[model samples]
Structures are given as structure tokens and as C-alpha cells.
Target chain A: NSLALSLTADQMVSALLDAEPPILYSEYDPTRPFSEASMMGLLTNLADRELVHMINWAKRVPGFVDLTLHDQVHLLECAWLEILMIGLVWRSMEHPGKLLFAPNLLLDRNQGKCVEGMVEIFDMLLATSSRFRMMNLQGEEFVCLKSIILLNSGVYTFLSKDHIHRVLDKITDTLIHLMAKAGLTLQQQHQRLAQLLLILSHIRHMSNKGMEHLYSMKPLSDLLLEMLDAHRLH
Target chain B: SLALSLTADQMVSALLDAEPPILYSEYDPTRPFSEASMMGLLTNLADRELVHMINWAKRVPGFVDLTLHDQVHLLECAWLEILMIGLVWRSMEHPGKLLFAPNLLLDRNQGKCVEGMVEIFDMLLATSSRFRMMNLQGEEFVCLKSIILLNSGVYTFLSSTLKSLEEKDHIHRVLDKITDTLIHLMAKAGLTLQQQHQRLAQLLLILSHIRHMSNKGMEHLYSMKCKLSDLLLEMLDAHR
Candidate 1:
């Protein structure tokens, strides 16, 4: 059943990312600069790169040879940092300020300093300890490398309510599209979705770090408890 | 299937000092940057460098909020930078040959070139990115990319001087038609009528990003030749 209430951070991060990855299915109009042919070629090219890596990994490891290209691409997409390119497009389409991911008016005006704060923050984070963990809608998890989407959010403050909400919305929309197009069902987890939205709203209003405690809970009751704890702690 | 694997440091690094940190965290929120104070703050961040080419551009007097006409101008300007960079990257990756794209409807026709057009690539990127992100029905971003490509990266390129801007203005009207088509596509694609309206903020940003980077955000221009192309090529190879 769909939970009509809110969700903790842990639940949101896990539910969404664990569900399914979106496919770049839209057809390109050739009227623009990058022709449909070039982009398709590029996507195909990226796929080729993945296959090569799969081949190498298979040669070096014992069980790797058993995996298929489809499985490898899935793992690669889940592991790649640049996949944030998809996230950037997602956020750019749903965000409010329009200045977050892509440089907005300032870039047009030729303002390098506008992003200085962002770059500075990136530098500081780079100096910190949590460099290998995977940061996403849920929370940080240990991983071999980091993705650019996470970097864009974490170092650049893309984790706030604004960024989170848009991302959530995009994920949901993408999921819905996938379902309709591919005839797939998402196992009706509106409860998690609701809770995710709820936590997002809480963060939007409060904007604090302790929200993490609230975000870590699973069941709605525990999630709500975390929310109350955050209120008490704050 | 593409997902980003973010490191602890890199993840948090992207969000530092972001304004109103929450709303501004996402790339292009549902709000227009021009209407937000963030735009000014963003401009002030780059005020110093903007003055390099245009002495008066530093003041950013009328830059805060741009009209559609000026917005197109801005997009053209930004495309220049992105394209310039893309060209460098494209050439380096595919050396000994400039990338060939069949320019449909151009008098120059069956065109061959010495360099990849970054302007076209940026426009393409912006268009492709936009279409992918939105649930819109038609060829929204791609159409915009097409119009820009056909006319050359800059609207001014259609004419010699700024005084001949009328022709450029006509091109913008054509853009509006493309936008309207996108709106219809959005409705057909299942976005609620309300969501369609809400999406305008983001749609404009995608366009604005295309515009802004085209004009001034080329700190990566030279880097594009070497870095971007390789990165893109590497990414391309990854999918296959």
C-alpha cells in the first residue's frame, strides 16, 4: 500500500535508486546542433566503452565472465559518475532557480565568480574524509568511486530541499514513463514516495543536518518519530 | 540504466555555499533565474571577468532580467563558448578529420569543414538534454538546436552588424512556434496541465543555460578541445 505520510532519508534513497534506472529514450530532432545521428552514435559509443570494461573485468576476475553485456551496463550505469549528466538534465528541468546545475544568467554575463563559491565548496569537500562513499537520494554508501551528480549536489549544495524535490519529481516522472512505455509496474510504493516528499518538505522548512536522523528511519512510524526527534533536537 | 556513483567528498562538494542552498541546489529549478535574486548574485560572482570584453557589461545594468529578444541574444552568445569548446574537444578526439553533419536547407549545402562546430554541439546538447529531461511530447530542444544550427551559432551571424538585428528577431518568432509545439507535446505526454505551466521555469533555464554558456561561460572553451571531447568520447564508448 502507498504510505500517504512521509519518509525518512534512508528509505527514500534506497527505494528510488533501487527501483530502476531510466533509459535515454527520447528521439532527438536533427534541426539542432548535435544531430540525432551524432547523439545516437555517442550513446552507442558509450555502450561500447562499457562492453570493453566488462571484457577486461571478466578477464581479471573469476566470476566476471558469467555476466552479460546487459548486466554489465546496468552495473556500470549504477557506478558511473558522469551519469549525473542525466541528473543535471533532470534537475535543470524541474528546479526553481535554474541557476544551480548549469550556470544561468551569470554565465551569460560571463561571471566566473558566481560559481566560485561552488568550486570553493568542492575544494573543501575534496579535502574532507568521505571521498569514496556513494551519495544519493538516500544517504552515503561505500562505493568504489563517486558520481558527478552526487558531486554537483554535495559540494555545490545541491542536496537541499530545492534540489531534492526536483530530483524526486523527475525520478517519479521517469518511472511513470518507464512503466507506461515498457509495461512495467513499480510495485506500488507510494508510501515511500509520500514519505520522501514529506521529508523533503520538512527539510525545505527547517533546513538542518539533524534531518538525517529523521531520514534514516524505515517504517512510517519510525520515520515520523525521527521527524519529531528532529523537532525536539532543533 | 545510467546512474552516477558519487564519492563522499565529491557529493558534498557540489553543494557547499549554495544560496538558499535548498532551492538553488538543483540545476534548473522550476523558477526562472532571471526572476530570482540568485541571478544577480550569480552575476556579481562573475562581474569582474564580464568586463573583459565589454567594458559596460561589468555593471550588468540591464542584465538582471532579460526579455525574450535579449534572451535569444544571450543564448547565442553562450552557444558560442560551448561550441568553441566542443569543437576543440571534437577535433582532438577525431583528429585528421572534422566531423561531418549534413546541413539540411542551407545554400552552402553538403558542407564539409575543418572544425566541428561547438555552437552546433552546445545547441545539440542543450536540445537533447532538454528533451530527455522533460516529459514534453514534441522535438522541443532539438528544434531549437536545429534553428540555431541552420542560422549559425550567433543570431548576429545572419547579418553583419547589430543594426541588422531585424532578421535575427524574425528567427526568434520561429523559436516561439517551436516552443508552442513543445507545449502541445507536453500535454500529450501526460504532464498535467498545471505541471506543464510549472515546467516553464525549468524549460526556460535549459534554454537560458544554452544561451548564457553560449555567450560567456567558456572558461572551458580551450579545455573543450582537449577535455570535453575526450570525456564525451569516453562516455560514448562507455555505452557501447
Candidate 2:
């Protein structure tokens, strides 16, 4: 309740970050008793559902729908893995040794290795997650991070780019204003904002490798078909 | 073994012999960006600087006379300040970007950063931006680079306050040559006597601003905890 009341009257961050499900809270366990194929299916199933939450949350973002719906879908095609990677980082940040894929699913490094590319991806994800843990990242900071991730789509030449720029600028004001209200020194706010960009670049690398992993899969998630247009066509 | 062991001149020549390549390809923003790649590029660039500064410092006219300990120690402390000056000089010709290497460049938004880093990064770029209008010269830049190295700030002399006459005299002599260079460069640049004091004061103000950057640079390297190498780590250890 104290956390909820801390936001200002006009702030949109609460709404933008509102739809995270694992925050709705539950426990997850996997017995480490699955075959490689079965485990790939299991992880993909979790991701696809997590992404259903992603779409629902994204559409709810105030200015995203302000994007042309066609361009909106185009950006999601490019950025979904980035979104998933950051979401997973936030979820797993507190639980050092495990990735919280869902409130109902978690995996340690070797546990997810039944799939071929999973281990190295696990290392990348955990390295970032560990860094976040070291920062002692707070809820508001992740809200700013999630909003920036949604706004920073750079892969396309599209109409949404202009609209999102206007939206992105609003959020930048929101970020710094939010920081000042949070009672940090001005220099610290500058630093925290840069730290967000640093994490954004990390998520981009993780996203690229993640596509390689998912693309290598014997293709799970019939639902993810649109984005996996797999331009890995080289 | 390079530190207290070798004569400053041997170490200086060794630097020139081992000088790293300076030219690099242009930055490409279309490629995938990674914190790991960004850091690796900085590591490559930093090692080149580590060697090149030693080479460049040798050409510093009066610098050879300072004892090796004070010479190497002052060089260690001023390395970050020197790097910031190069970044400023590189970007002074281009309006919106900081050209770190030919290949390593960033716009304000395009850069990646560490904790406590981007502010200093912006400070360096903003300082660079201010230089774009200065009507600066090649001689002025060469002298500016030497000043960042040999002026080395009052931080240069705080530990030297721990030094008596000979120690103080060594850096003092080097500082004298640089100020003399700055004065003659302006004297030749044909500035009014009034303009001379103003520009000297401006140049020194810039030198001071560059020193403030050293604190942040040290903390960033501390966060990186980069296991640089035996002598490489030696200079880095002495950096603070």
C-alpha cells in the first residue's frame, strides 16, 4: 500500500507495469524429471503463456496502441524476446541460482539443459540477473525499465517510431520526475537512467541469442508463429 | 618490473617500440549492441591507450627528467584525464557524437554505460562540444595533451607534497615548459594580451574539469574489476 501510494497523480507507470502476472504471486516447482524434448516443450509452453501476458500488457500500454496497429504488431515481432528476457531478469533477480520463468515454473542452470542451447542462454540471463541483484533493483526502477523497453523499439522503419518518440519523451519526463520524487540527488537520477540503458543493451544481446535458441528448436509454441518469421534465413 | 626497475628512459623507449595501432573502422549502429561487446571494445581501446600514452609522454619535452617513480606515478594518475582529453579532441570536429575510436562511437542515446559512468561520459562529451567553437589549433591540441599528462593537477603534487625539493622541482620544471608552450602558442596565435589571460584561464579550467572526471573513472574501473595484466594492472592499481 505504501508502494502504491508513492506514485504521483498523473503518472502512467503504474498502469504500464500493471499486468505482470508472476507479481500476482504463486509458487513453481519442476522435479528435474523431464526428457529433453519434453522439457523444451515445457519451457516453450511457459514462454508462450508469459507472452500472452506480454501482449495483453503491451496493448494496455497507453501510447503503444497510439502506434499504428500494423506497426504495433511489427515492433512486437521484433521486440518480444527482448520483452521476455527483461521480464525474466526481473523475476529471477531475487532468486540468484534459479530463473523464474513463471510463478509456477523455475529452473536452475543445469536443470534446463535438456535443450541444446539452453545452458549458455541460462548463463547470459543469470549474469544480467546477478548484476541486477547486485544493484538491489527496486520495483519502481523496473517499472521505468519496462516502460523504456516498450518505447525503445529500433529495428524497423515504421510509422509507430514517430508516435512512440512522442510517447517515449513523455516517459523520459516521467522517469526523471519519478526519480526526483523518489528523493534521490539529481546526479543519481542521471545515473539510474543510464543504468536503464545499460540493461537495455544487455537485454538486446540476450534477445539475439534467445532467438538463435528458439529458432534452433524443433519449433514449439504454435502461437509464436508470427514473430519467429525466423529471418535467421541465412 | 617496469616500474621501479627500469630507467624512465628505457621504459619510455619500450613504450614507443610496443605502440599499439591507432586507426580503426567507423562505428556501425545497425549491428546488434551488447554490453559485453561495448566493454570488450573499451578494453581493446584502453590497452592501446595504455601503451600509446607511454609513447606520447616520452615526446613530452621536459618530462624525461622527472624521476621514474614520480614520472610513472604521475602518468598513472593522469591516464583517465588524458583519455578524456582524446575523446574530447576526437569529437570536437563532429557535432553530435563522441568518437571514442574510429569504430567506437556513440550519440547521447546510443551509448551504454556503467554505474556512475554516463554522467562523466556526458560531461566529457559536453566538454568536447564546447571545444567545437574554440577556433583551436594543432599546436594548442598538442600542448593541451601534454598539459593533461604533465600538469597532472594538484593531485599530482599532493603525494609530492609528501616530496621535498628535488621531487617538486621535477614536475615543476615539466609544468613550466607546458605553460611556456601554452603562452607561446597563444603568443604566436596572435591573441590580444587580454585574450591571452582569458584563454589560459579557459584551458586551465578545462584541465580542472577533466580532473573531476578521474574520480568517476576510477570508480568505474573498480566496478569493472578487470583483471588487466601484470604491468597493465600495475598502472591501473596506481591509477587511484
Candidate 3:
């Protein structure tokens, strides 16, 4: 049962991610003069469009709806920062040292002057992607890790903790089982799992940094408003 | 993806300050073209240049708020003038070679080889010479492009299509904004009021020739049976 669980999670995550349309595919002219304000505005717009897809993808995660109605909402509301970071690093892994913000809007690590303190955040995002590339992070690993992060994020949570633990354990079992199938030696499996979990630290670190960077660049949308809402430390 | 909603003041501020970054190299005048080839090649430049203009136009204040139909119509309307002004401005640098395009260095002698191109080419060359003498500033050129485009409805498409009175007022407000910027920038030249008027009149006079030359351009392409780039062909009033 657990074996099939991880397999489905991997495939379904990939499916919806690819199935999700590019809502803010932009038009660019390299010859035109630069306007940093428009570039950052494009990033905000991209976040808005991607949030819709993120919610759609979350709703379809296996056993996600099994949680009580309100529990499902808070998990997403809490972890979106990490969830979005995972996708950003994954999509950007192919292009070393750049964030492919959208099909048309790739940014250099240094193209971060738009916001007051964006350079540090941009550097962090690019470095995480570099790690993704360095590890040669594969598709199943990417999907399972994303599933874990989606259910697992919330460096701070919202009036909830108990409902997610059981489901989280089930997914963790499949992840270890996946390592077994890869013919890892007993100790190798432990080391690989350790490495995977270590990545969560980086994700959380960037998420915190991103959350802070965003504090410097506020938004007008409700999702943006909630993203800015205060939360207790987990 | 992101829309630019800057006010006219903000829009002009960027346009007048941030100079274009498209690097330039001197034109090489040796490449020759047949009658068909010169017309075909030169117009394709307009086709490519039109794409550049549409993107630039979108950044203009209120240009996007116009209905999508009007946004494109406004673009199609003045594409010829936009291309002409850019070409003439570029040509102002080199007296001997008309930089009709970035690489299309048309020597005066070369225009004689292509039958009807000579007349239009010379008209452009003459205007370019006059502009060069004025020592035109980039800020002035920036505002002038907007001024011509905002007023494009009267010149290119005629007895044709235009919509609401509000749209006319919207266009008027934008023109007022740009020409106002032009006067403000021109005032920095230390010219007295009459000289500014003299300068402004001369600039408008340049528009008349480009507008006339734009019509001749339409006729030239039509007479040659120029099946232009599809976007430009649809844009121009030539065929019908």
C-alpha cells in the first residue's frame, strides 16, 4: 500500500505541475531600455498566477483531503513559501546560476536591485538551485520531496499539528522504500535520507529569507495579505 | 506579464532619461539590392521594427488602456511614421550613407540603382540632413516619437475607423502630456519664447515631410506589388 502511495505521489505531482498552464508568460525585447520596477512587478504577477496553480495542485495530493476541511487549508496557507521555493529551484535547476521566473523572464543572480534588499534573497534562491543541480536531483526524488515539503512546511503552523502527522508518516515510509529499490546499501540509504532531510533546512532558510524579502516588497492581493500575516514560531 | 501603469510624468521621465541601449555600428554601404530586393528587404526592416514599436508603445502611459483593438489600430496606423522617424534619426549621424536600417547602409549612388527608391530615399536623406543641423537632443526625439504616434489617426488611416469621443480626448490628453514635456525640455536650451516656437514649428515641419513621405511609401510598395510581411501588409493602407 505504501509502495503504490509514493509512486502515485511522484507521478501526480509531475502531472499537475506540467498540466498547470503558464498564466503569466511574458513578452520581452532585449533591445528595450531596462525598467526594474516592471521586472519586479512581473515577478509579483507571476507569483499571483502560480499561486492559483499551487492551490490546485495541493488539493489533488493523495490523502490531502483526508484531513478535516480546515486542516487542508491551513497546511497550504502555512507552507506556500517552501512549496513555491521548491518549484522555483526545480524549474531553475536546468539553467545554472539563473532563475527562470517565467518562460520570458529569466533573471541573473545579480538582477536583484529592484527591491531594497533583494540581492541576498536572489543569491539564496540561485544557490539552492545550484544544490539541486549538484545533487543531480531526479524526478521521483523531486516529486516525493515536494510532497513531503507541501505537507511538512510551516516553520509556523495555524492552529493545527495533530492532523498531518499520520499522513506525513505514510509518505516518509514510501520515500525510504524508494531508496531501497534504488539498491542503496543499508547505510547508504540512511545517508541519502539524511541528505534529503537536510535540504529541508535550506528550503526553510530560503523560505524565511524570501518571507523577509517580501516584507520589503508588499503586495495588494489577499493571498499576498495572508502571506504577510503574522504567525507563531513552530 | 506585468502591466506598466505609470503616469505621464513617470512615463516621460523614463523615456527622456534612459537612453536606448541597442548598440550601434557604422553602416556598410557596399551591399547592393535589385529593385525587388531593396523594396522587399527595406520593408522587412519595417516589419521587424514594428514589433519593437508595439512593445515601446505599450509602455507609453494610457496606450494599453485603450481597447485591444485600438491598441493595435493605433500601432498599425503610425508604424510607418515610427519607422521613418527612427530611420531618419539614425541617418542624421552619417551624411553620406542613409542608415535606412541598422545594416542597410544605402549610399546616394545605391538608391539610383533601385528605380523608385531614389525619390523616397532622397526625401529621407534631406530631412536627416536638416535634423542633423538642429543638433537634436535625444530627449526631444523621444517626445517627438510619442507626439507623432498620438496624432497618427489623422495622417495614415483616413475616412476609415476611429471610435469614441472619450478615446479622442484620451489621445488628446496623452499628446498634451508629451508635447508639454517637449516644451519643458526645449526650454532648457536657453532659447527665448519665439526661438522655441521657431524650433517647435521646424520640428512639426519635419513631421509633414515624413507624413507625406509615408504616403509615398504606401504607394511605392503598392506599385511594386510588394507582398510585404503579413503584419506590416495588414498594417499599411496601401493595397486597398
Candidate 4:
């Protein structure tokens, strides 16, 4: 009953994150300040590209397109941060103890922190990535978790209340059953599912912490700031 | 506008101090009310709290200018978060004591096992601890609550009875203004930028826990649907 759906989810994630794209190589002018309009323009382009990718990923969630356009937008607004953090953590796994914000941009632990407590967020990211690696989390499980986070009406308000509930219930049931089928007892399945939910909460905190770091250290463009506001809106 | 510009602490006190507590200890959990009676009571409670929240929100300067639907939408969605914020703040005022209402108080452990009651208290204690550990000030606390309330996701299709992009833009602008004010307050308090980041991050982290608790409340309470009124269910449906 669940395998087919799980397979579909796995395939969807591969398509979502693995495609190649043309790179835009640009450097900041040496004489310009960080606050320069040209610098802001470059940052805005990066943010816009990221937002377009997020919307595309969201559109691929099963039955996501069936939702009223308003609800679709609301889900995208609320879940962007979680989705962003998940991708960031997944990418950072290759180089432990560092964050890969973009293909060409890398930041050390200190560079990421504009505040004292901000380092804790990076620690959390590393821990989460390590746990994923340790558990040997399958591609199916990753997609299921992402879908669960994306469709959480509790975190992100949905207009069609039943719509989100139905989708979340479906994903959760599939994930739970898949765990049981993979050589674990019912108790372990329950524990594993609960931990995944807790991780969503952790991701939310990390997103907020990261946001504050940016707001303090950088002069964000309006477009970039809007993306961050999407996190707070929920 | 005056109220909007008031120091964050004063605004927080004005907004939160007006709510009446649940007084859960005063009611009997074992006894059951008939469906009609239950619905009537639940409706009364929901309406009372909604009114109180709206009144406070109206003082936020541009809030009243929002379409009635948008205003109601924001309140319905954000009330629980705001309610808990006040509860957590009061709990921090006196450790181990939860002020259920201005006149009612309960020891943290007083209610242990009323169908997931312990879990709720566990969340409450954690929330209180975070507030205490950070020594959260009134200014920052108020700003955090306002940010939660002004959140744009609250307005679903049902809420846009007649809405526009500027309505969304206005709310965001207000949030930005309040956030800027919070930063200024933090700076005035003599904290370095790093310290300010720590405070803001910690505040939002605490709010995420509160959001989780809100979801849990729906699951726990809604799972026992036989015991609640239809009116209560409807309200929970809209808000949760």
C-alpha cells in the first residue's frame, strides 16, 4: 500500500534537488561598499533564483496544485525556511562543521554567527546531518520528511483545512509503515516518526536563529528580506 | 498611533493584562456537560477571548484600518500564541507558580494527569525556563508577540473577504517598524550587536516550542471529540 507512494516521493526529491543549472559568475567591485546598489542587485538575483526553485519544488508535492492558489502561496511562505535549512544541512554534510549556503559561497562557523548564541544553530545543523547519515536515511525517507514539513498546516495556516490534514496524514502513515517494514518493531517506528517531527521543530528554531544573524550582520535587499519575512509570517 | 509608539513593555502590559485566565482548576474534568451546554460554554469562552485580543490589536495603530476580515483572521490564528506568551510571562514572575488567572494560581505540579495534562505542563515549564534563562525584557517580549500576531499566513481564502496586496504590505511594514524599534531598545540597553542577536534568536526559539504546543493541544483535545461541543470544534477548526 505504501511502497508505490514512497517511491514516487523519492523520485520527486531527486528531480527537485539534483538538476544542473547554468552558473552566473560575478564578483563585487573592489571600490564598492557592501551597501552599494550593484551588490544589492547581485544578492537579489541569488534570492530570486532560490525562491523560484522553492516554488517549483512546492508545486511537485502530490496534490499541491489542487489547492487554492492562496493556500499554495501560504504553504510556500510558511515552509520556505524549513525547506531552505534542510537543503543547507544536506549540502553541508560533505564538509562537516561548515555551511554551504550556495554553490560558490561557503561560511565557517564564526563567519555564520553575528551573535554569541548563533553558533549553537550551526551545531544543531551538524548534529542533524550526522543523525541523518548515521540512520542511513533513505532518499524516500528524506522526501517524506520534507513533504511532512511542507504540508504541516499547524506550522503554516491553510485555507482548506481538510486538504492539508489529508495530505499530512497520508505522508505520516506511509512513513510509519515504511519504517516498520524496514526491519524495525512497531515501537521503533513510533520513536523514529516522533524524532522526525521533533527535527522539524528544531529546523524552525535554526531558521529563526540564522535569520537574526543575517539581519544583524548584512544589509539585506528588499527581495531577500521578503524571503526572510516569509519565515516570520507563520 | 500613540499606543503603537508606546514603549514595548507598556504595550505588552496593556495588551496582556486584560485577559481572564482559564481557571482550569475550578472546573471538574470528570463531570460531563450535555452537548448544548458544552457548546454554549465553549462559544462564550472563545468569544470573550477573541474580543479581548481584538481590542488590544486595535491599538496597534494601523491594525484597525485593516479590513474586518483580515483583522479577525489575524486574531483567530495568533490568539493561542499570544495567550501562551502572557501565561509564560506570568509564570516567570514567580517560579513554580502558574497564574491561571489574576485571582487563581496553581503549583506547577498541581495538575498532573488529566488526559495529557502533564505534557501540556511540561511544555509550559520549558517555555517559562527559557524566558527566565534569557531574562527576557518587556520590550523585546512585546515585539515578539506582535510579530507572531501580524504574521501573514493567518489570512487564508476565508480571510480575504476583500483584501489587497497593500494590506499584506502594510502589515509587513508595521512589523518592520516594530522590529527596528526593538533593535534600538536592545542597543539602548547597552548590549552589543552580538548580544542582541542572541536575545532575538532565543526569543524566536521559545516561540517555536509554543507553536509546537499549540499543535499538540489540537491533537490531544480534538482526539477526544466526544467530550467537546460542536461550537468548540468549529472554533478549533478555524484557529488550529
**Residue ranges of candidate 1 with Cα displaced over 4 Å:** A1-234, B1-138, B147-165, B212-217, B222-240
Better of 3 and 4 by lDDT: 3
- Candidate 1 lDDT at B132 equals 41
Predicted candidate 3 versus true structure: per-residue lDDT over B1-240, tens digit per residue: 111344445656767553343433333346545666666676666666666677788766667667676676667656787788887888788995788656567777778776666666777777787678789887788877876666655211221334554565466556545555555656677976435544554465356456545655655555565436677767765223
Candidate 4 lDDT by residue in tens digits, A132-159? 6655676667776777667662322321
Output the lDDT of residue B147, model 3: 62
User: What are the lDDT figures for the candidates, one per model?
Assistant: 0.30, 0.61, 0.62, 0.57
Clashing pairs in 2: B160-B163
Total residue pair clashes for candidate 3: 0
Instruction: Locate the minimum summed-lDDT window of 10 residues in model 1 chain A.
Output: A151-160
User: What are the candidates' individual DockQ scores?
Assistant: 0.02, 0.01, 0.00, 0.04
Specify the CAPRI tier of model 4. incorrect
Model 2 segments beyond 4 Å from truth? A1-10, A21-31, A155-160, A230-233, B1-240
Candidate 2, CAPRI quality class derived from DockQ:
incorrect
- Candidate 4, residues B1-240: lDDT per residue as tens digits? 353465645554554564344433223455553444433443455455555666667766567767787786776655666767777787787676656555445553554425465556666766676578668886666666776677523323232223575576566556555655565667789987545433443444355566656655544555455453453456567642
lDDT of 1 by residue, A1-234 (tens): 123114443443344344333232322433333433443344334333433443343233222223355443333432232232233323333332232232321111122223322332222122121111111222221110122122112211111123333533343443233333444333222212222222221112112212222233211343233323433311
Question: For candidate 1, what is the DockQ?
Answer: 0.02
Docking class of 3: incorrect
Q: Pick the candidate with the highest DockQ.
A: 4
Query: What TM-score does prediction 3 earn?
Result: 0.45
Q: TM-score rank, highest first?
A: 2, 4, 3, 1
Residue lDDT tens for model 1, B1-240 = 000232322322321221111111122444443323332332232332222323222112222233444544543343343333222222332322322211111111111121223333433343443344454322443333333332232222324456655544444334334344445556666777436534533443333334323322332233333431343333223212
